Design a protein around this ligand. Structure first.
Ligand SMILES: CCCCCCC[C@H](C)CCC[C@@H](C)CCC[C@@H](C)CCC[C@H](C)CCC[C@@H](C)CCCOP(=O)(O)C[C@@H]1O[C@H](CO)[C@@H](O)[C@H](O)[C@@H]1O
Ligand SMILES: CCCCCCCCCCCCCCCC(=O)OC[C@@H](O)CO
Ligand SMILES: *[C@@H]1O[C@H](CO)[C@@H](O)[C@H](O)[C@H]1NC(C)=O
Ligand SMILES: CCCCCCCCCCCC
Lengths: 104, 276
């Protein structure tokens, strides 16, 4: 007590071009407490081979994590960042808009 | 200018018999060290992460950190008795130092409880945060009287060992911490801002260091609607920034995105919107 709700931002490291190797990032920030589930998704399924930064926190003591995975976009493929946390009733899926990204 | 080295810890107490402890070392925003909990050892993340320290000094510190993690967890689990309505709870520690141009170093040791300031270390004394009442004062009493050798060790680490280490760590990593990394940019269309309106997006990614300038342009005329987002982290030490522009129907042709960054030095990136 108290508890703060994760903010979820999804963006690519390089221009989203089908068939080109790229990196998908999910930056999850501003949450408390640290217990959290963050997963990168391809077509609904957790991406098993991902990287994440070690847990860190801001001056206000809220935590942040950076997730990233190498991925090759295609036209059919859908990418997302899913986050569960005590402040969240349902897991929250933020879908990766290829053109815009998904920031707040 | 000032540079910070932070050793942070996170202790998550789930119940009377299960806690977990995490920890890392950060040079400003760049993680330089991890902690391996199953072997209780330092993870050196860069080839230069040992700074100018010998393996002997680092082994000493490693043993000190593992003793610290275990003994802090144990004393907290002891003193949290059978009050299992108080679980789960979470303790954060941020300790370290800052080098300053022209000033003496700063050393700090700050503790949070459930995300609120609890207490800090002030030269010789554990000081309860005014905004955390009874518990803070209680913990500080114990820290000030029961654990005095721990306290002189802490003083020495944050005021003497930490800046010495940080100086050697900057020097060992000098070819990296002062790097200049050029960004790339690309354009895309964004969600509709409204009927008869379009949103253009200029993505700038892969720059270091963090200061950056981005504007939408028509020729040499900067555009009023330019809006920059947050500077967001990439992996491998670069950053990302989105700059959008809302434009009325039938006016996107001729717009460009212009990027200035220290790494370009008089080679602004200029990207023309090609459609639409
Ligand atoms: C954990 C995250 C890791 C991240 C990786 C980071 C890796 C990098 C490389 C770090 C290097 C950077 C560094 C140079 C900068 C350091 C700055 C900052 C860390 C300050 C933090 C101070 C520490 C955490 C608090 C522990 C002090 C207590 C524990 C004192 C206890 C000892 O004191 P003591 O000797 O008196 C007890 C003795 O106990 C014996 C047995 O019973 C008795 O025999 C004996 O007589 C005594 O009683
Ligand atoms: C053996 C040395 C290892 C390093 C650890 C030294 C620090 C030990 C910290 C001790 C934890 C203190 C918990 C205090 C809880 C308490 O006793 O206060 C309860 C109040 O709520 C009652 O007013
Ligand atoms: C404490 O929590 C751990 C982690 O979930 C669990 O394995 C263990 O059974 C718990 N201990 C209890 C409830 O006594
Ligand atoms: C709920 C039990 C108390 C939790 C807060 C203890 C913080 C101790 C920090 C000491 C640092 C060496």
């Amino acid at each position: 007590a108290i508890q703060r709700t994760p903010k979820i931002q999804v963006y690519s490291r390089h221009p989203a071009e089908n068939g080109k190797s790229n990196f998908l990032n999910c930056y999850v920030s501003g949450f408390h407490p640290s217990d959290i589930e963050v997963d990168l998704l391809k077509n609904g399924e957790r991406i098993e081979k991902v990287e994440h930064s070690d847990l860190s926190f801001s001056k206000d003591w809220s935590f942040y994590l950076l997730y990233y995975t190498e991925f090759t976009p295609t036209e059919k493929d859908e990418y997302a960042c899913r986050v569960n946390h005590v402040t969240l009733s349902q897991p929250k899926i933020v879908k990766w808009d290829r053109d815009m990204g998904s920031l707040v | 200018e000032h540079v910070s080295f932070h050793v942070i810890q996170i202790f998550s107490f789930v119940n009377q018999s299960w806690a977990r402890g995490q920890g890392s070392g950060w040079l400003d925003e760049l993680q330089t060290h991890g902690w391996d909990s199953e072997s209780g050892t330092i993870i050196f993340l860069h080839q230069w992460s040992k700074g100018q320290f010998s393996n002997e000094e680092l082994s000493d510190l490693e043993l000190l950190f593992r003793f610290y993690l275990f003994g802090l967890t144990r004393e907290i689990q002891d003193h949290a008795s059978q009050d299992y309505s108080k679980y789960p709870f979470e303790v954060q520690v941020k300790a370290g130092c800052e080098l300053h141009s022209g000033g003496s170093p700063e050393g700090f040791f700050q503790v949070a409880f459930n995300g609120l300031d609890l207490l800090s270390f002030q030269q010789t004394t554990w000081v309860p945060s005014p905004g955390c009442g009874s518990l803070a004062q209680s913990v500080c009493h114990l820290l000030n009287h029961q654990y005095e050798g721990v306290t002189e060790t802490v003083y020495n680490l944050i005021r003497s060992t930490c800046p010495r280490f940080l100086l050697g760590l900057l020097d060992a990593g000098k070819m990296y911490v002062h790097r200049q990394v050029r960004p790339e940019a690309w354009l895309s269309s964004g969600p509709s801002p409204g009927p008869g309106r379009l949103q253009l997006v200029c993505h700038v990614s892969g720059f270091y260091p963090k200061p950056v300038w981005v504007m939408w342009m028509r020729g040499e005329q900067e555009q009023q609607g330019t809006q920059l987002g947050d500077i967001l982290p990439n992996a491998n030490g670069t950053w990302y920034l989105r700059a959008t522009l809302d434009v009325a129907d039938g006016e996107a042709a001729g717009l460009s995105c212009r990027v200035k960054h220290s790494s370009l030095e008089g080679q602004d990136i200029i990207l023309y919107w090609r459609g639409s």
